[PDB]
PDB file of C-alpha atoms and ligand atoms in Angstrom:
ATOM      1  CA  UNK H   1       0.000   0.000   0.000  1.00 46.36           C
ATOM      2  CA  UNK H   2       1.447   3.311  -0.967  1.00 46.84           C
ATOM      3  CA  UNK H   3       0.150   6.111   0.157  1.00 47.96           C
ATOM      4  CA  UNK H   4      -1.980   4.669   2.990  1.00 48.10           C
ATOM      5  CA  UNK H   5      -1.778   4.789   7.096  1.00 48.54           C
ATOM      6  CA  UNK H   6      -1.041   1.808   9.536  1.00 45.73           C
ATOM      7  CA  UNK H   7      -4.538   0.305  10.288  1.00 49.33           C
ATOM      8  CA  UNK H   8      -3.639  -1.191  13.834  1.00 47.79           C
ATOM      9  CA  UNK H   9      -3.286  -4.513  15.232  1.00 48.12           C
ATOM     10  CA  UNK H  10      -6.033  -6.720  14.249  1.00 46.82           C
ATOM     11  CA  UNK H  11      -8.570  -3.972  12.988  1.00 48.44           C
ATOM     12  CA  UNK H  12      -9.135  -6.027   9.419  1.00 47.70           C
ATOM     13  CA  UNK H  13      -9.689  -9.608  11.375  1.00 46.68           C
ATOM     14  CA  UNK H  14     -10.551 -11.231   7.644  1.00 46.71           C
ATOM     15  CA  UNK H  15      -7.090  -9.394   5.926  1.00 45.88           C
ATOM     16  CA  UNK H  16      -4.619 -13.210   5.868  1.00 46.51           C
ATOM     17  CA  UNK H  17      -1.510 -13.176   4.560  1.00 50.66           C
ATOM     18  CA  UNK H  18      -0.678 -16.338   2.500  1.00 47.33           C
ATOM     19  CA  UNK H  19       3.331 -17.861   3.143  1.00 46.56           C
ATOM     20  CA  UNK H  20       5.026 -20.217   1.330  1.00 45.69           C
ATOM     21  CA  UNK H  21       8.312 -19.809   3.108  1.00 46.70           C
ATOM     22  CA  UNK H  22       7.131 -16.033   2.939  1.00 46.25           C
ATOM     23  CA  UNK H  23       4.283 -13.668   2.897  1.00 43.27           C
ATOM     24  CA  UNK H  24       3.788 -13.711  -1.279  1.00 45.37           C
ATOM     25  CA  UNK H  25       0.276 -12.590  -1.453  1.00 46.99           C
ATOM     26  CA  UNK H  26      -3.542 -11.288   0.628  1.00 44.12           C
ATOM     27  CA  UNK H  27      -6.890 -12.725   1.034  1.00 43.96           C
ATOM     28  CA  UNK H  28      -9.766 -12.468   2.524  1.00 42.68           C
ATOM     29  CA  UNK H  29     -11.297 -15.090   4.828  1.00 42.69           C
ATOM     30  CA  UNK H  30     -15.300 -15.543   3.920  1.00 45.43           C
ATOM     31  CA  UNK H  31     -16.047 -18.260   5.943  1.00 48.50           C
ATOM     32  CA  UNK H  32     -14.359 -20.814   8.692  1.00 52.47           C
ATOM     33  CA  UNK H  33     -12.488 -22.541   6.103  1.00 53.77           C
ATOM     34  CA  UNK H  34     -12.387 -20.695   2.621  1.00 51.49           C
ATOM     35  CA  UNK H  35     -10.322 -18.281   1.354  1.00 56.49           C
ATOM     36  CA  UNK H  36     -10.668 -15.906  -1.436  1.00 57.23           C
ATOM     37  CA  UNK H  37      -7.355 -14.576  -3.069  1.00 59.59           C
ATOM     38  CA  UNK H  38      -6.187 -13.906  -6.964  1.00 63.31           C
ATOM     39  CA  UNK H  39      -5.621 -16.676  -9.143  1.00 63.39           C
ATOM     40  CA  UNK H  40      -2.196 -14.908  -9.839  1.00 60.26           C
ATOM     41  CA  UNK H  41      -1.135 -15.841  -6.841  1.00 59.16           C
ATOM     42  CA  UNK H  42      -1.582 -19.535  -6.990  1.00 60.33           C
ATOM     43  CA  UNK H  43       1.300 -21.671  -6.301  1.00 59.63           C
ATOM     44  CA  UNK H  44       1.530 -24.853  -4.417  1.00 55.20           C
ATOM     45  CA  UNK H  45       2.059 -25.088  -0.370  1.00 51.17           C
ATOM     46  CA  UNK H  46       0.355 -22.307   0.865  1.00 54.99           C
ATOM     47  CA  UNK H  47      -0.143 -21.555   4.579  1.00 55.44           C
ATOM     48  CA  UNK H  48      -2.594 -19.306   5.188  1.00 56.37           C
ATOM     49  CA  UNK H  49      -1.954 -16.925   8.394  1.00 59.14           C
ATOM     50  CA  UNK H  50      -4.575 -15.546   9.821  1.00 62.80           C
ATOM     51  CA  UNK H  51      -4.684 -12.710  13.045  1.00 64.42           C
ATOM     52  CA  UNK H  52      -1.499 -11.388  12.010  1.00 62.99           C
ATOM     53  CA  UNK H  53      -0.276  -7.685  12.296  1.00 64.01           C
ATOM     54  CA  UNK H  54       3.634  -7.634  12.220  1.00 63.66           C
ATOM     55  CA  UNK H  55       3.857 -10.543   9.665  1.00 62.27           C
ATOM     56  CA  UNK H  56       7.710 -10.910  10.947  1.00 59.64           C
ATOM     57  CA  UNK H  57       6.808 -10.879  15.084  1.00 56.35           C
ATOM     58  CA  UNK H  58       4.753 -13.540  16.591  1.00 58.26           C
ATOM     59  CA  UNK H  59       2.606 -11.303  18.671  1.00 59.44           C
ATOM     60  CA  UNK H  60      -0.336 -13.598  19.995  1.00 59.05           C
ATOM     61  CA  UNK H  61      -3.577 -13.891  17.577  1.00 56.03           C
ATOM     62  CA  UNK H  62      -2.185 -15.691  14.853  1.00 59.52           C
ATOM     63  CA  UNK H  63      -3.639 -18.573  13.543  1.00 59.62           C
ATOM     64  CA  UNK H  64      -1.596 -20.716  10.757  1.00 60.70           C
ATOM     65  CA  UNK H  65      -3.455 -23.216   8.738  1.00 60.94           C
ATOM     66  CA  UNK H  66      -2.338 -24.932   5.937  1.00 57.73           C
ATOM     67  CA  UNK H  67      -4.155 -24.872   2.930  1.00 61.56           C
ATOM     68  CA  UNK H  68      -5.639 -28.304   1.561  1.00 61.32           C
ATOM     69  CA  UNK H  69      -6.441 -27.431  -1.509  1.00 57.17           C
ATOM     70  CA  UNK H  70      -6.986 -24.096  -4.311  1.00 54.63           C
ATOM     71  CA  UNK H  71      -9.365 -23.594  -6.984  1.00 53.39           C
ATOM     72  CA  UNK H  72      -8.443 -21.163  -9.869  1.00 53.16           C
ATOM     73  CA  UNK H  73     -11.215 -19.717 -11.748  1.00 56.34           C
ATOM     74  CA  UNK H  74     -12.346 -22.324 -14.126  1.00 56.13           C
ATOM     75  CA  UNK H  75     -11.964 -18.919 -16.852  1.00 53.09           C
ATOM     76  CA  UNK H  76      -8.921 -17.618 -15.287  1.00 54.47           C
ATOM     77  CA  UNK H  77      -6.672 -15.614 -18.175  1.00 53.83           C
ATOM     78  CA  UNK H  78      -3.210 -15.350 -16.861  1.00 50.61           C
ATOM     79  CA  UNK H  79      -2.136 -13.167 -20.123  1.00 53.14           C
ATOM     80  CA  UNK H  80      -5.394 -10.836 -19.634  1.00 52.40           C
ATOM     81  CA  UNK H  81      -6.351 -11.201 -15.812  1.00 49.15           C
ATOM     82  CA  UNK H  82      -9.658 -11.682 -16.628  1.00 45.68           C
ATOM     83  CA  UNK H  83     -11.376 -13.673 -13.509  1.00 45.17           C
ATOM     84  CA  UNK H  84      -8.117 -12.898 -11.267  1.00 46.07           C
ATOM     85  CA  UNK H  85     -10.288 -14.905  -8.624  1.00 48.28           C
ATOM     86  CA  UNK H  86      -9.112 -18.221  -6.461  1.00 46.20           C
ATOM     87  CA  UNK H  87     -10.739 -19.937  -3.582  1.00 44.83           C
ATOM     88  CA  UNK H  88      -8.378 -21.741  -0.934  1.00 45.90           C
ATOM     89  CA  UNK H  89      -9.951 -24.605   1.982  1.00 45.59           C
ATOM     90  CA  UNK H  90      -8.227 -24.805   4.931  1.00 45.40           C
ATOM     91  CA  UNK H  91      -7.182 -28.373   6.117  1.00 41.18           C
ATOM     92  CA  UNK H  92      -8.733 -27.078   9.814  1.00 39.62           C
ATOM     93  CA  UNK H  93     -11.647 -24.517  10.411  1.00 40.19           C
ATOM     94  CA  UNK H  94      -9.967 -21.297  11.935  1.00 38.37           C
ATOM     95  CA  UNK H  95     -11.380 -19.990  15.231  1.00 38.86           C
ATOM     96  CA  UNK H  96     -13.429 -17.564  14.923  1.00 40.50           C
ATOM     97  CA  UNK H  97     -13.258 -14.720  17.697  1.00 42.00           C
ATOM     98  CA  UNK H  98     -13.149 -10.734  17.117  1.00 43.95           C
ATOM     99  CA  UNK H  99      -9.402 -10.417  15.778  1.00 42.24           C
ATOM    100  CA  UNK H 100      -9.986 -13.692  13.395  1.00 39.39           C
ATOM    101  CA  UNK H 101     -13.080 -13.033  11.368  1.00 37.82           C
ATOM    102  CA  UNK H 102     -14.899 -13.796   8.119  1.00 38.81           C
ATOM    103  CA  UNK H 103     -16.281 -10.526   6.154  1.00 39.95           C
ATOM    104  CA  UNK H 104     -19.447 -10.931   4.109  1.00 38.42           C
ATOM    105  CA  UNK H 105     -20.009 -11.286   0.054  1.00 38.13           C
ATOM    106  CA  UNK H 106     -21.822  -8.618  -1.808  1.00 38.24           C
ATOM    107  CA  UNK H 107     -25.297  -9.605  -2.641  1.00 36.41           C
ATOM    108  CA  UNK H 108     -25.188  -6.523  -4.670  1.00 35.68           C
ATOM    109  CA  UNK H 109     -22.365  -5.094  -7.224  1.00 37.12           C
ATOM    110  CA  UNK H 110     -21.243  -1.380  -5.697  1.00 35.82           C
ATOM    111  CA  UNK H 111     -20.839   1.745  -7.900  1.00 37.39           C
ATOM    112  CA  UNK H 112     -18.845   4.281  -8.661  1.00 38.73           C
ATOM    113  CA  UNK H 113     -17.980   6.706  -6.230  1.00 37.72           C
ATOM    114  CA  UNK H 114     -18.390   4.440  -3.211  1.00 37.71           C
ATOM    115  CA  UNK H 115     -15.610   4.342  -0.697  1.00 33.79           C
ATOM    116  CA  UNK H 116     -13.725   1.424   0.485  1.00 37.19           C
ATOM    117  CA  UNK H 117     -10.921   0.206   2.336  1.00 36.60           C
ATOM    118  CA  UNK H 118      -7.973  -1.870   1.086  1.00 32.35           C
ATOM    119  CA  UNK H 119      -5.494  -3.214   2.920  1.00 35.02           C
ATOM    120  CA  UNK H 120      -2.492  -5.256   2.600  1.00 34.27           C
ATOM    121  CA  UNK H 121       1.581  -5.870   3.697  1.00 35.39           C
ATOM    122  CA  UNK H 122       2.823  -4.748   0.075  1.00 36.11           C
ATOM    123  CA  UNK H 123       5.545  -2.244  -1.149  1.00 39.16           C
ATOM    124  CA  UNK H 124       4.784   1.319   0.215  1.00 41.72           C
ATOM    125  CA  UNK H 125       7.026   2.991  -2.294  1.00 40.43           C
ATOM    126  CA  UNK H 126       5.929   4.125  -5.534  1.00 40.48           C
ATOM    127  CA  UNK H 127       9.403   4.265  -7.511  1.00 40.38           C
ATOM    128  CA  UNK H 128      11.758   1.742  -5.356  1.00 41.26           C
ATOM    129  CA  UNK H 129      10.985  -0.295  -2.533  1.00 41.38           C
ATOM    130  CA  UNK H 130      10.008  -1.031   0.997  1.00 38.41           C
ATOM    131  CA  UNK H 131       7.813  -4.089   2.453  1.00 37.63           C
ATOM    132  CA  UNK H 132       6.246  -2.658   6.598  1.00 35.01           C
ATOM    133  CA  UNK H 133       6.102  -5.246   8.605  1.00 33.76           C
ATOM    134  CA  UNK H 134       2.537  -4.951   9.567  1.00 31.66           C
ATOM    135  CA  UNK H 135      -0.998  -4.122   8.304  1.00 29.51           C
ATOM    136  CA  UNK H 136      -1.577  -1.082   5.586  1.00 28.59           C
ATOM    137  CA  UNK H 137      -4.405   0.509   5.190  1.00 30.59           C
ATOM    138  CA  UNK H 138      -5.865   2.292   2.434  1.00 29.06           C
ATOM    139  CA  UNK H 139      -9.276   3.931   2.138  1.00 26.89           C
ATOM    140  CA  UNK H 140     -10.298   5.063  -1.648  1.00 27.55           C
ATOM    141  CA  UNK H 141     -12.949   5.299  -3.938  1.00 28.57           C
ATOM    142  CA  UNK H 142     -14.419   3.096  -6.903  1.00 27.17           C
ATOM    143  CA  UNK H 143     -14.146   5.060 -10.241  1.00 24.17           C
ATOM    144  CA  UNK H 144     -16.495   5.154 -12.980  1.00 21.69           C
ATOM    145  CA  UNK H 145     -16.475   2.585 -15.709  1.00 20.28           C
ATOM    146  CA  UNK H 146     -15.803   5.327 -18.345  1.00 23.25           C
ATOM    147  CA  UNK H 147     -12.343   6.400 -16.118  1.00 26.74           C
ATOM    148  CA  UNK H 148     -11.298   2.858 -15.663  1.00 30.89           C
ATOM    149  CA  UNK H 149     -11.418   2.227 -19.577  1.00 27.22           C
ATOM    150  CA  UNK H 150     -10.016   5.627 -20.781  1.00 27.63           C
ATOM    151  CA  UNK H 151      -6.636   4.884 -18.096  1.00 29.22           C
ATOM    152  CA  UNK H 152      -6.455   1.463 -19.331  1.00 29.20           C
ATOM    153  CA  UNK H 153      -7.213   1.658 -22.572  1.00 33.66           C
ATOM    154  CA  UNK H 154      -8.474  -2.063 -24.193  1.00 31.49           C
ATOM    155  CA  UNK H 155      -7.428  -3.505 -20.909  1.00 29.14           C
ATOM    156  CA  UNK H 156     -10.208  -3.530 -18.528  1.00 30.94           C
ATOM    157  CA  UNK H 157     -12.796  -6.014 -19.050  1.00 32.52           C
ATOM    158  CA  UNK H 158     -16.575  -6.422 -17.089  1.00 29.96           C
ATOM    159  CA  UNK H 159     -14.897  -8.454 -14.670  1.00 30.99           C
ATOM    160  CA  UNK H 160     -12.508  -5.809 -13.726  1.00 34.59           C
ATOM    161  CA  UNK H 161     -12.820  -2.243 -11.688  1.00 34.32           C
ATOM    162  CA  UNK H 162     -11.068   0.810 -10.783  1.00 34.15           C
ATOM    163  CA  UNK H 163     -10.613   2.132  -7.267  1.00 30.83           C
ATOM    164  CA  UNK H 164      -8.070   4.863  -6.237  1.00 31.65           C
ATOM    165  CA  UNK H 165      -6.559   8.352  -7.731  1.00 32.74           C
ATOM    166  CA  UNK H 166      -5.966   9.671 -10.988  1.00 32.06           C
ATOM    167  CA  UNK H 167      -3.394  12.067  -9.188  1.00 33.95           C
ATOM    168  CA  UNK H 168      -1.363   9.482  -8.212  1.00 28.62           C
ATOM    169  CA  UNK H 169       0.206   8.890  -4.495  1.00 29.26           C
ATOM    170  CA  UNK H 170      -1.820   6.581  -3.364  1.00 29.67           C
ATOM    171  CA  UNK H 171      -2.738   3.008  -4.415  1.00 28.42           C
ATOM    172  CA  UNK H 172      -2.308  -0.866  -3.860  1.00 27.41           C
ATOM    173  CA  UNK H 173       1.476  -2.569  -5.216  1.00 28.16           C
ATOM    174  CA  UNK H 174       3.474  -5.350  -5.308  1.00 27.24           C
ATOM    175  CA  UNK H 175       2.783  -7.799  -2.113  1.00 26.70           C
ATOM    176  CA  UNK H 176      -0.829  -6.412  -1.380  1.00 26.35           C
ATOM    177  CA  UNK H 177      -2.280  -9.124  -3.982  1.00 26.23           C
ATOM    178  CA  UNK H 178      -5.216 -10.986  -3.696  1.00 28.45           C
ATOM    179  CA  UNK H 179      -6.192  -8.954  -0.915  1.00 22.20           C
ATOM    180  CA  UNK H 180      -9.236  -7.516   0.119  1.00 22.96           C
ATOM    181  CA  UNK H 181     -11.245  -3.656  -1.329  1.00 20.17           C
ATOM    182  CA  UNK H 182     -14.169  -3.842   1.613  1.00 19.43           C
ATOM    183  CA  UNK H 183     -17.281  -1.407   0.570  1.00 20.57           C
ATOM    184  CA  UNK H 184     -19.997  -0.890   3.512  1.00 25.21           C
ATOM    185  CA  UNK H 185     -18.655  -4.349   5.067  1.00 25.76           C
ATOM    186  CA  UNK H 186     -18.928  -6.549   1.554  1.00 25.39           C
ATOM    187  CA  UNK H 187     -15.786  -7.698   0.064  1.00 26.55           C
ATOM    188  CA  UNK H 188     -16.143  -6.422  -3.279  1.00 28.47           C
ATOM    189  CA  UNK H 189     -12.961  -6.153  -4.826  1.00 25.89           C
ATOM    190  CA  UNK H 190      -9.293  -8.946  -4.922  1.00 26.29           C
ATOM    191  CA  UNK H 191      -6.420  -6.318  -5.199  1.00 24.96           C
ATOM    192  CA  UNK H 192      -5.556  -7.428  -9.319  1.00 26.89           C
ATOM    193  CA  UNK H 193      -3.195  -5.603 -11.212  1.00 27.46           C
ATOM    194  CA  UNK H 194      -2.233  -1.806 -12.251  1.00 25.51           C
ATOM    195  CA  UNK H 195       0.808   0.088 -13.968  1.00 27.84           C
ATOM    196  CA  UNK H 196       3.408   0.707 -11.575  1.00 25.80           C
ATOM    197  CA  UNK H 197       1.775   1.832  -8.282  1.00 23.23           C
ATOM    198  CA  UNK H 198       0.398   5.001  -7.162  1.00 22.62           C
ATOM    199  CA  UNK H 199       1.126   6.742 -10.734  1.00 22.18           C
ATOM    200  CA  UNK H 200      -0.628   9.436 -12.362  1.00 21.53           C
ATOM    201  CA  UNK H 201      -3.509   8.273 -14.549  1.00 19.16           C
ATOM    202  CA  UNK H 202      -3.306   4.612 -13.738  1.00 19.54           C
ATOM    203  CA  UNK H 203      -5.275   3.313 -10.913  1.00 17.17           C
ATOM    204  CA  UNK H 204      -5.654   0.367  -9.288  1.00 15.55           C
ATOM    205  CA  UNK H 205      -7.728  -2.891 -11.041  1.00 16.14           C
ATOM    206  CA  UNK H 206      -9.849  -5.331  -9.040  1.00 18.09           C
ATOM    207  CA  UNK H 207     -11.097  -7.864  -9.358  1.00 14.84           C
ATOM    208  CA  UNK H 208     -15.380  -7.322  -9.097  1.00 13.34           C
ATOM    209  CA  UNK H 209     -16.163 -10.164  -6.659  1.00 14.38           C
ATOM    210  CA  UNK H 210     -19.764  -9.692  -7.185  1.00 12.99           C
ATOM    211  CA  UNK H 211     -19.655 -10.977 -10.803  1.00 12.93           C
ATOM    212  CA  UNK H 212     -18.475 -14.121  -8.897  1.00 15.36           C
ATOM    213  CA  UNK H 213     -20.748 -14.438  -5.971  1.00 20.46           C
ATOM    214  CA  UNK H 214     -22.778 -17.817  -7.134  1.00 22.71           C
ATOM    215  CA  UNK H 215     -19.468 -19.495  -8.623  1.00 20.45           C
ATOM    216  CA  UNK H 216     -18.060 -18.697  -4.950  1.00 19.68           C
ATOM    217  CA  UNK H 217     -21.230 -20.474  -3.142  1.00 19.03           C
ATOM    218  CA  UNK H 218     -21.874 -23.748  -5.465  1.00 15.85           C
ATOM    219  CA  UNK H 219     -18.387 -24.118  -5.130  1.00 16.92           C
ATOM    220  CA  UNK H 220     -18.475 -23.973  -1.594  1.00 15.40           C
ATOM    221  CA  UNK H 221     -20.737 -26.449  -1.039  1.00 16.93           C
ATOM    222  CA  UNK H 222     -19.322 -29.121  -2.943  1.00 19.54           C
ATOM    223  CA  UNK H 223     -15.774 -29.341  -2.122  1.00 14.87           C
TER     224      UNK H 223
HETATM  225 CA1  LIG A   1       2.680 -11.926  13.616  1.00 12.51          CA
END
């Protein structure tokens, strides 16, 4: 997160960080035992760590669970990140308590102009670089379809929003990942892709969750 503010210790109880070895990559926990991340961050052997503020200092809420198994978006585009959207069981259900906690799904799509926080352990700098040790926090708006396509021109597809500043300054980067954009306590957004971070005239793209809601569910309850 460039730009942003240190949220505090356990203030986003559904932000996890996902290790393999290392923090790589965010998510959000929506339930017990599911995760939702990016699809560009699949790789084998994830642990999924939830409770955590200083992701380098064990500090007394965590929770590490190994994942047993990840689902990619069965129309996951790796060249286009179209459907930037995986789902990641837990071998054990997490405790749930107030600093470990699942956050809703949308049952409707937001618009532009509402506001939303993202959060996330990545690179704070917008030329260079700099991981914090603990929790980011970033609050911004959704921009309007019409923005979105004119920054990112060809690029952004119905799958896909906007959310930040055309100044620049402030944004999601490198490391904040297939973590969570939370709108009026709905996840509706997996921090996707953008130019750079934090420039002028090119935002951050998420990945619109609510496009995704009954794939999430069905696929849920079978696995
Ligand atoms: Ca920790």
């Amino acid at each position: 997160i460039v730009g942003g503010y240190t949220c505090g210790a356990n203030t986003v109880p559904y932000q996890v960080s996902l290790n393999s070895g290392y923090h790589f990559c965010g998510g959000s926990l929506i339930n017990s035992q599911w995760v939702v991340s990016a699809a560009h961050c699949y790789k084998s052997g994830i642990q999924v760590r939830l409770g955590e503020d200083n992701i380098n200092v064990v500090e007394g809420n965590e929770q590490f669970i190994s994942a047993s198994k990840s689902i990619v978006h069965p129309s996951y585009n790796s060249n286009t990140l179209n459907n930037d959207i995986m789902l990641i069981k837990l071998k054990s259900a997490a405790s749930l308590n107030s600093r470990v906690a699942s956050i809703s799904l949308p049952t409707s799509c937001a618009s532009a102009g509402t506001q939303c926080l993202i959060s996330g352990w990545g690179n704070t700098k917008s030329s260079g670089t700099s991981y914090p040790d603990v929790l980011k926090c970033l609050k911004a708006p959704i921009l309007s379809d019409s923005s979105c396509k004119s920054a990112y021109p060809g690029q952004i597809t119905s799958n896909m929003f906007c959310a930040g500043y055309l100044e620049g300054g402030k944004d999601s980067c490198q490391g904040d990942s297939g973590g969570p954009v939370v709108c009026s306590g709905k996840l509706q957004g997996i921090v996707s892709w953008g130019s750079g971070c934090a420039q002028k005239n090119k935002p951050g793209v998420y990945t619109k969750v609510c496009n995704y809601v009954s794939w999430i569910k069905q696929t849920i309850a079978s696995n």
